[PDB]
């Protein structure tokens, strides 16, 4: 479903990424590793549609459409979701209003329709339970008063609700613990239908113990210098 080819991207005037190629097929879990400054979070930012990232070469296309020409909301409509490394607080906007508006948006974009409130909050209850969220989540302003763990799990809940085709975790395992990680793992894993694919950009690799990658890739000075299966070890 996803094909990225010879990607030269630069912010700052950076040399961030000089030629990266990755091809992802439906039903696959890919892990992405490396040291900081390799550009992995830039990879995520470029896929998500962050504005200040200049693409100086190559292309990224998703199901045969050029992704790089699409706005963030359109890339989301196409089924790309990103779990943020630092989920944003949006005071004054309830989780319910947010998730419902987004859901209606992507249902519309996909030519499908639409959740009755009755069923929508059943879905919500199910996902709240699944990720062990506060039961009042719907009426609380998004991520306000949440710890890092709660924000991470919240974004995974969003992932569960909006039903994306390609899910990217962008250093989303940061600052979590063994079993907050079991929880996000449960949430992510409950989403494997053999259709969806997952790109895990790792802060550190223990996440891959609870979400096991079918493939593993390693970044250096932006570039993929290694690939393999679940089994890869260091030093």
């Amino acid at each position: 479903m996803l094909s990225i080819k010879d990607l030269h991207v630069s912010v700052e005037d950076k040399a961030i990424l000089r030629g990266l190629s990755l091809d992802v097929h439906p039903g696959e879990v890919h892990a992405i590793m490396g040291p900081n400054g390799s550009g992995k979070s830039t990879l995520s930012a470029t896929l998500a549609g962050r504005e200040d990232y200049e693409v100086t070469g190559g292309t990224v296309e998703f199901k045969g459409k050029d992704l790089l020409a699409l706005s963030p909301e359109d890339r989301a409509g196409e089924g790309i979701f990103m779990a943020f490394q630092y989920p944003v607080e949006i005071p004054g906007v309830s989780n319910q209003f947010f998730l419902q508006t987004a859901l209606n948006a992507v249902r519309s974009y996909r030519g499908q329709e639409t959740l009755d409130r009755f069923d929508f909050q059943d879905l919500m209850e199910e996902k709240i339970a699944l990720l062990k969220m506060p039961e009042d989540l719907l009426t609380r302003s998004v991520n306000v008063g949440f710890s890092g763990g709660e924000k991470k799990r919240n974004d995974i809940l969003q992932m569960a609700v909006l039903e994306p085709e390609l899910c990217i975790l962008d250093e989303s395992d940061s600052g979590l613990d063994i079993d907050a990680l079991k929880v996000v793992a449960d949430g992510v894993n409950s989403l494997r239908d053999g259709k969806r694919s997952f790109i895990i950009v790792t802060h550190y690799q223990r996440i891959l113990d609870y979400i096991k990658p079918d493939y593993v890739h390693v970044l250096y000075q932006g570039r993929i210098v290694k690939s393999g299966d679940f089994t890869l070890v260091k030093q």
Binding site: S71, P72, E73, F98, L99
Partner: protein, 414 residues
């Protein structure tokens, strides 16, 4: 300028008997004249469009269908005014409503102005009649009083002008809600002016709501007065959305102890518009608490102007007052000019203000877009949230929703 003389001729116009009060106001209007951009209080608010124009006072007439097409959906006691003129046919019977209402030009009992300025005078002189509204002692009317103003322009470069004058007396222990609604019949530009004086007696509770909803091309210049006795409560919420140039004054005196005052306004300039919202508050007695929240959202080369002043009289002790102005600038050419002001003549008091100027959080916007929500919908969620504190004070849900729609029309949507 030529404008003063035109207004003068409108004053002395055919077959119009004018009260002594109106003439007295006209003469001080003519004495001070019109302010320039180098006046202390006129720096940011343009008069150039208004003072070169040809003015006429033409009272037209409208059908009930037009009225209800423009009207709020609300259950109320509704008085309807067209082009400075009370229209009985379009109004509701006030008897037994709890409101004792009399429309006429007798001004003998009307209070003096708290702060006098040129346009207050203009409206006072050109007002064709006075609405005398009284709520008797201890009474708490079931329905809110709604004063609807329908003003229209005329064909040509002529500016049709209309000036409305109301006075409301809340008797000791009375509790009432009053709403000002301002709309344009059509897109022809017009010059509106309005003065609403309210007297709040001991243990009386007032809720005042002003909705200035008129067309993008018109001029709205208004000055309201609130007089509070001791143990009195007054809330005033103004949502100023409409007009090309709008300048609103609310002047309040706290003349008795243990009174509560709260004054809010919302300004949302789009497209070259200038929205000027001003307050004047005097704590003349101690033990009063006052709170003010003034929010502006500026788009599109728009200009918001805030001015507010808290004067704490000598010896008014245990005064508690606060003023907040929050301004959000989304246009690169957008401007906000804000001057919160304290004049404090008593030592044993607590008085503070704060004023902020801020942007849209780009990170929030992106976060919302990344889940599939359109950029404009996102920006609207955030903006709505920013004005939510103001719109949430409207207790009537039906009314609140209409106001929120009116707000929505000026957003990046609809």
């Amino acid at each position: 300028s030529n404008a003063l003389q035109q207004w003068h001729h409108l004053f002395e116009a055919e077959g119009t008997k004018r009260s002594p009060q109106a003439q007295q106001h006209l003469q001080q209007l003519l004495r001070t004249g019109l302010p320039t951009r180098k006046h202390e209080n006129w720096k940011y608010t343009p008069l150039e469009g208004l003072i070169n124009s040809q003015f006429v006072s033409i009272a037209g007439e409208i059908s009930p269908q037009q009225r209800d097409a423009l009207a709020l959906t609300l259950d109320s006691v509704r008085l309807v005014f067209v082009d400075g003129r009370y229209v009985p046919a379009l109004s509701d019977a006030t008897e037994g409503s709890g409101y004792e209402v009399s429309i006429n030009d007798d001004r003998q009992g009307l209070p003096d102005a708290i702060q006098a300025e040129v346009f207050l005078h203009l409206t006072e002189s050109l007002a064709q009649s006075v609405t005398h509204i009284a709520v008797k002692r201890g009474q708490r009317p079931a329905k809110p009083l709604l004063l609807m103003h329908i003003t229209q322009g005329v064909a040509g470069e002529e500016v049709n002008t209309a000036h409305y004058r109301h006075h409301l007396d809340l008797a000791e222990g009375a509790e009432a809600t009053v709403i000002e609604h301002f709309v344009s019949l059509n897109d022809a530009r017009h010059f509106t002016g309005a003065r609403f004086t309210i007297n709040v007696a001991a243990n009386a509770h007032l809720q005042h709501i002003k909705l200035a909803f008129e067309n993008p091309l018109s001029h709205h210049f208004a000055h309201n007065d609130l007089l509070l006795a001791e143990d009195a409560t007054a809330f005033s919420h103004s949502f100023l959305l409409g007009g090309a140039v709008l300048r609103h004054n609310t002047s309040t005196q706290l003349n008795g102890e243990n009174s509560t005052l709260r004054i809010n306004s919302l300004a949302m300039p789009v497209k070259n518009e200038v929205c000027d919202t001003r307050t004047w508050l005097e704590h003349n007695k101690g033990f009063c608490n006052s709170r003010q929240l003034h929010k502006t959202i500026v788009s599109d080369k728009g200009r918001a102007v805030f001015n507010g002043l808290i004067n704490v009289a000598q010896h008014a002790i245990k005064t508690d007052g606060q003023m907040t102005n929050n301004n959000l600038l989304m246009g690169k050419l957008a401007e906000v000019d804000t001057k919160p002001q304290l004049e404090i003549y008593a030592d044993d008091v607590k008085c503070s203000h704060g004023a902020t100027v801020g942007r849209i959080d780009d990170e929030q916007i992106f976060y919302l877009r990344s889940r599939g929500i359109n950029q404009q919908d996102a920006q609207q969620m955030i903006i709505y949230a920013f004005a939510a504190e103001l719109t949430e004070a409207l207790r009537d849900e039906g009314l609140k929703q209409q106001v929120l729609a009116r707000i929505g029309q000026r957003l990046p949507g609809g």
